[PDB]
From TrEMBL, chain B:
Annotated organism of origin: Ignicoccus hospitalis (strain KIN4/I / DSM 18386 / JCM 14125)
Transmembrane segments: 5-25
Source taxonomy: Archaea, Thermoproteota, Thermoprotei, Desulfurococcales, Desulfurococcaceae
Protein name per UniProt: Archaeal Type IV pilin N-terminal domain-containing protein
Automatic annotation (TrEMBL), chain D:
Included range, full protein: 203 to 310 of 310
Protein name, per record: Archaeal Type IV pilin N-terminal domain-containing protein
Automatic annotation (TrEMBL), chains E, F, G:
Organism: Ignicoccus hospitalis (strain KIN4/I / DSM 18386 / JCM 14125)
Highest taxon of source: Archaea
The protein, known as: Archaeal Type IV pilin N-terminal domain-containing protein
Length: 33, 51, 50, 108, 50, 50, 50
């Protein structure tokens, strides 16, 4: 095993969690151009 | 008249406990979650990489 | 493993013909009635069934 | 800090990674996994205790884990890779059931 | 950061970033996914330029 | 406000409001009912979005 | 200080403080109540962290 990922960062394309405040910081996702 | 009164109270007690067993048993049942079976493996449309 | 430790470590501070075992386990969350927490009272190492 | 007279096992939340610098040399990193770890009980004793500074490691009879990944570290001085092809590990649960896994030892 | 990610009908991609992977010395790599139910799935990815 | 609530034949719902429950950190919750006779009943409710 | 304590309909708690109980060495404890009529009742309480 080179590396292991058990969790993931929130993605930009997620309407449910995009306009919320979690743990004191608003939510922003990831974007690819 | 001791036996007559004693027997009556004993009959009532056993009836009450039996009905309580029923509620507990039936509530115990239909209380299992289980799982879903993941679909067949996803077909690979492409595998690639960039800098 | 390294049994010889100074205030700084060289590559020769690590021993040869010695071994430490590592294991990674992933419990599955949704099992039947399965419990949230897994407990272990005893761990054993076997070789040739002994 | 490792002594052949004091073998031990324990539960830690993480995974092991191997990185190759060259054909026969490697670099190794141990990472956190965000999992829970608790200890069931304490049995009188201690690990590598310092009487002067009150330093020591409590020993408990039961170890527990939670959701997500976790590792097991085992140290038995009697195991020799040059003469043993493979070894096996067995875990005994609190309820009495058991589980076993297989680990190759051969270089490759 | 969330522990579990889910998807639905139609196509979807997976983006993986591991700094340890070097194309000049590795012919190919492999990826493994672990499901919530505990089952697993694996795919094969060539790395060689061509 | 009354100490005991009763129902009859056909369907009925239960509305529960506890400010302490947070969907973002709790995977699921559970509810327990205590009868007048002393017996009990429990049900399971997922909270996860999906 | 009174020798007898009484309760009525609905919920109620019992608060017990014994300095001799140590969570680090005791897996669990037990409580026993003695009624005015002489009958007895007992309950079980885990102490282990979890």
């Amino acid at each position: 095993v080179v590396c292991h990922y058990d969790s993931f960062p929130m993605t930009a394309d997620d309407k449910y969690h995009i306009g919320q405040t979690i743990g004191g910081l608003t939510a922003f996702g990831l974007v690819f151009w | 008249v001791s036996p007559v009164i004693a027997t009556l109270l004993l009959i009532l007690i056993a009836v009450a406990a039996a009905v309580l067993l029923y509620t507990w048993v039936s509530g115990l049942s239909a209380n299992v979650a289980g799982t879903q079976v993941t679909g067949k493996s996803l077909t690979l449309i492409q595998a690639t990489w960039a800098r | 493993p390294a049994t010889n430790v100074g205030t700084t470590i060289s590559k020769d501070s690590f021993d040869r013909s010695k071994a430490v075992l590592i294991l990674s386990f992933q419990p599955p969350a949704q099992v039947l009635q399965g419990g949230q927490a897994i407990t272990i009272d005893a761990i054993d190492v076997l070789y040739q069934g002994r | 800090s490792f002594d052949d007279q004091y073998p031990f096992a324990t539960i830690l939340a993480g995974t092991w990674e191997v990185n190759y610098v060259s054909t026969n040399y490697v670099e190794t990193n141990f990472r956190n996994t965000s999992a829970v770890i608790k200890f069931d009980r304490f049995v009188n004793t201690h690990y590598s205790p310092d009487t002067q500074n009150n330093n020591g490691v409590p020993i408990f009879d039961v170890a527990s884990a939670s959701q997500s990944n976790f590792a097991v570290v085992i140290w038995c001085p009697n195991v020799n890779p040059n003469v043993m092809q493979s070894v096996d590990v067995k875990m005994v649960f609190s309820d009495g059931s058991t589980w076993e896994a297989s680990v190759p030892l051969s270089i490759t």
